């Protein structure tokens, strides 16, 4: 009767109305707080992604073999059951999975019989006995898994990840105030390329990250890095171009930055840095450097070395002096110097040909120079400023600027 009601309740036209897209550009069916799964849903064969939210006591029939176009499955806070043909087909076809385990049993045990699975979104929560989750350490049956994002209060990285390190590539963990420990399980990462740890309460960068020899990027989000002294081994991460250490507490930046020059993306926004050294800008390959909402006293002139820079954010700083060598670097596409203690915008600013973005919002300026016309890629939107600074262009310059 439940299944008959489901088929009767939801006509295929209603499902056409429900059809939408998702965060991964797939045809999604958002099913919210349903009694079950109708067969009318499986009658749709153009479907690319299924979204089942708190639809519990649900058994997946063979009828899902109708829709071959599935690539993503969203099994959110729902205890789902299975059938043999469904196991075979979702072993053959399903690749992207996004489940939420509000309850541990609301995580079903059959995710791990698959092999074609590639993306996994393990949002939810976990208890103290982390290692007892045999559900995690069955991903040895998964061969194609490449994306793993676990938003949970996970203190110990499981031996599951240790086993699946050969083919896994991306980590995204949100502990939300929970300390992460037992970092040997992240040491025995070998082929991993991306690591985004959020609120893991890692006081120091472990030797786990340096044991990784092919890490494309690292995120130490919401992690209390008071000092950065283990960067000496960071040279082993030759693939490391992204170091997004933002909202952090790095009080000063040492010479150890010379260990790696392949670094390209560098986010130290809201950091505790007081004065930049002479030793950051030696690594000329850096293009993407962030110091947003910091409190730097002033900018030393060694910034002239960073020529291949294309992004230099120091917004909301206490910087009162911008030397003209950052204006000398013309490859600097983005350059955000907003809400600092600077005085006057540089008159010789039109020399920067490739200056796409100059966020200098809230800076205490007096009068804009007339050489903004010489700037090829700076706009009113790009040069975000208070309006009493916008009102300062000469009339012929207004005629040339309203027409860009």
């Amino acid at each position: 009767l439940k299944q008959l009601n489901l088929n009767n309740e939801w006509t295929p036209d209603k499902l056409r109305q429900k059809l939408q897209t998702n965060a991964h550009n797939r045809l999604e069916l958002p099913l919210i707080m349903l009694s079950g799964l109708p067969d009318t849903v499986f009658e749709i064969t153009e479907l690319q992604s299924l979204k089942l939210e708190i639809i519990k006591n649900v058994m997946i029939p063979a009828t899902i073999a109708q829709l071959d176009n599935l690539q993503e499955l969203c099994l959110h806070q729902c205890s789902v059951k299975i059938h043999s043909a469904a196991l075979s087909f979702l072993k053959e076809n399903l690749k992207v999975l996004s489940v939420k385990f509000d309850d541990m049993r609301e995580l079903p045990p059959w995710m791990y019989g698959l092999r074609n699975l590639e993306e996994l979104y393990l949002v939810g929560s976990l208890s103290h006995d982390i290692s007892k989750n045999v559900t995690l350490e069955s991903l040895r049956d998964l061969k194609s898994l490449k994306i793993l994002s676990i938003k949970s209060n996970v203190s110990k990285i499981p031996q599951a990840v240790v086993d699946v390190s050969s083919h896994l590539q991306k980590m995204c963990v949100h502990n939300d105030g929970t300390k992460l420990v037992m970092l040997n399980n992240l040491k025995k990462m070998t082929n991993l390329t991306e690591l985004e740890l959020v609120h893991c309460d890692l006081e120091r960068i472990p030797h786990a990250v340096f044991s990784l020899l092919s890490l494309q990027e690292l995120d130490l989000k919401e992690n209390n890095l008071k000092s950065i002294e283990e960067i000496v081994s960071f040279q082993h991460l030759r693939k490391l171009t992204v170091l997004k250490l933002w909202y952090n507490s790095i009080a000063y930046i040492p010479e150890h930055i010379k260990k790696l020059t392949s670094l390209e993306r560098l986010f130290f926004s809201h950091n505790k840095v007081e004065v930049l050294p002479s030793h950051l800008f030696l690594c000329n390959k850096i293009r993407y450097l962030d110091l947003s909402y910091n409190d730097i006293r002033f900018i030393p002139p060694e910034i002239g070395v960073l020529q291949s820079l294309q992004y230099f954010s120091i917004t909301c700083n206490k910087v009162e002096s911008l030397p003209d060598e950052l204006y000398f670097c013309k490859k600097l596409k983005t350059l955000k110097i907003g809400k600092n203690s600077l005085s006057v915008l540089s008159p010789k600013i039109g020399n920067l040909l490739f200056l796409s973005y100059l966020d200098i919002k809230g800076n205490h300026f007096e009068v804009l120079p007339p050489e903004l016309g010489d700037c090829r890629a700076l706009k009113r939107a790009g040069l975000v400023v208070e309006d009493a600074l916008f009102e300062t262009l000469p009339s012929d310059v207004r005629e040339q600027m309203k027409a860009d």
């Binding site: 006509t11 991964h24 550009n25 983005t334 796409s356 973005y357 706009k379 009113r380 939107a381």
Partner: protein
């Protein structure tokens, strides 16, 4: 009592709301699990498509004459019992008829007596004992037939359809992976204009496809052709302007397609093309080009030749950098560039004005350039991208885009 109750239950008012529109923009009502056709349904006079789907053995009354605009009937597993006045009205009015059946008895015999019928669609296996291509012998009575879709899993085209093909202009065959025995038997339908072999699993092109001179659109959907080698003979097809070779194992494009200069809608998507070559761009007439879900190494420079290109679709292919020659053309309208490995979008997109939508979600897109705001036709619905990447744009240009969007 049931029919009288149904007339009361399904009222004209609720059915006016039930009225919807299809892809052909035609007012239509979908009758699902109805006991019969309510008289409130037949009272409607603005109806264009009446959907008798799963209506058990319903007798059509003469009041169908009230359906003056009625041109489309889709009898889906619905045997229609009809009498002489309704027959006359359907013969004089009705012109398109998509009969879906699971049995020979489900197919009504009066559908072969309609004069004005021009579009006829069959779904359901037609291979049977002592009835193979004999039940449709009444297709000779139908002289106005122009569209004949046969989703019948048939192994060979019937000869009665070949005699019909003198006046037939469109023949689409769906066999669901069954090889249709061509034997160059389609040379009789010289009037054929759109041969859409859907899921025919041919794996080759027979000579009858390029023997007829009247085909403009030839879509070999899921025909599983390994090598596209019969395209040299298609240059005699001056009418041919839409050669949709999607859903095949074409692993490489030979240079010989540069012979076919008349092509406009070359949809070559969902294949394993390692690369579209420069000689492929030798067809400057190409206006619509689809290469989505392919194995391209990159996108060459000779795309600057295709000045008429409007929608270039390379979604989920392997293109690392966008060439400026792509932006050299100004007629681009729908850029399906999402799910790619595009490192960044060049500012030359500001040159594009006809661009009304561009798929930029996913990819390796570092930031969206401000020049996207220079495009007038582009709006928020057109510019589909992640929220953070959209927020990378300056606030005021985003406000401009918002204001141009909502109004």
């Amino acid at each position: 009592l049931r029919q009288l109750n149904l007339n009361n239950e399904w009222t004209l008012d609720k059915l006016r709301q039930r009225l919807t529109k299809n892809a052909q923009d035609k007012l239509e009502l979908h009758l699902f699990m109805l006991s019969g056709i309510p008289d409130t349904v037949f009272d409607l006079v603005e109806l264009e498509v009446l959907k008798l789907e799963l209506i058990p053995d319903v007798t059509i009354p003469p009041s169908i004459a009230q359906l003056t605009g009625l041109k489309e009937l889709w009898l889906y597993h619905t045997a229609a019992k009809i009498e002489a006045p309704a027959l006359a009205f359907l013969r004089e009015n009705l012109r398109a008829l998509h009969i879906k059946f699971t049995d020979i008895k489900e197919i009504p015999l009066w559908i072969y007596s309609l004069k004005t019928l021009e579009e006829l669609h069959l779904t359901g296996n037609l291979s049977a004992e002592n009835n193979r291509y004999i039940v449709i012998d009444g297709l000779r009575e139908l002289k106005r037939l122009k569209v004949l879709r046969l989703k019948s899993n048939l192994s060979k085209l019937p000869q009665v359809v070949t005699d019909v093909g003198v006046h037939l202009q469109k023949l689409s065959i769906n066999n669901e992976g069954t090889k249709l025995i061509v034997l160059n038997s389609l040379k009789k339908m010289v009037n054929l204009t759109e041969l859409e072999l859907i899921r025919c699993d041919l794996e080759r092109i027979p000579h009858s496809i390029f023997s007829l001179h009247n085909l403009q659109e030839i879509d070999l959907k899921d025909n599983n052709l390994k090598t596209i080698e019969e395209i040299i003979s298609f240059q005699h097809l001056h009418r041919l302007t839409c050669l949709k070779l999607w859903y095949n194992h074409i692993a490489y494009i030979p240079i010989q397609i540069g012979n076919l200069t008349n092509l406009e809608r070359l949809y070559l998507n969902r294949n394993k093309i390692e690369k579209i070559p420069t000689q492929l761009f030798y067809c400057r007439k190409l206006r619509y080009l689809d290469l989505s879900h392919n194995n391209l190494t990159f996108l060459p420079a000779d795309i600057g030749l295709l000045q008429n290109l409007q929608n270039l679709a390379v979604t989920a292919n392997r293109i690392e950098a966008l060439p400026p020659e792509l932006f050299q053309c100004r007629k681009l309208r729908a850029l399906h560039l999402g799910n790619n490995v595009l490192q960044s979008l060049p500012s030359r997109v500001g040159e594009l004005t006809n661009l009304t939508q561009i798929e930029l979600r996913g990819n390796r897109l570092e930031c969206l350039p401000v020049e996207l705001g220079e495009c007038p036709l582009l709006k928020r619905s057109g510019l589909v991208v992640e929220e953070d990447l959209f927020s990378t744009l300056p606030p005021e240009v985003k406000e401009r885009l918002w204001r141009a969007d909502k109004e």
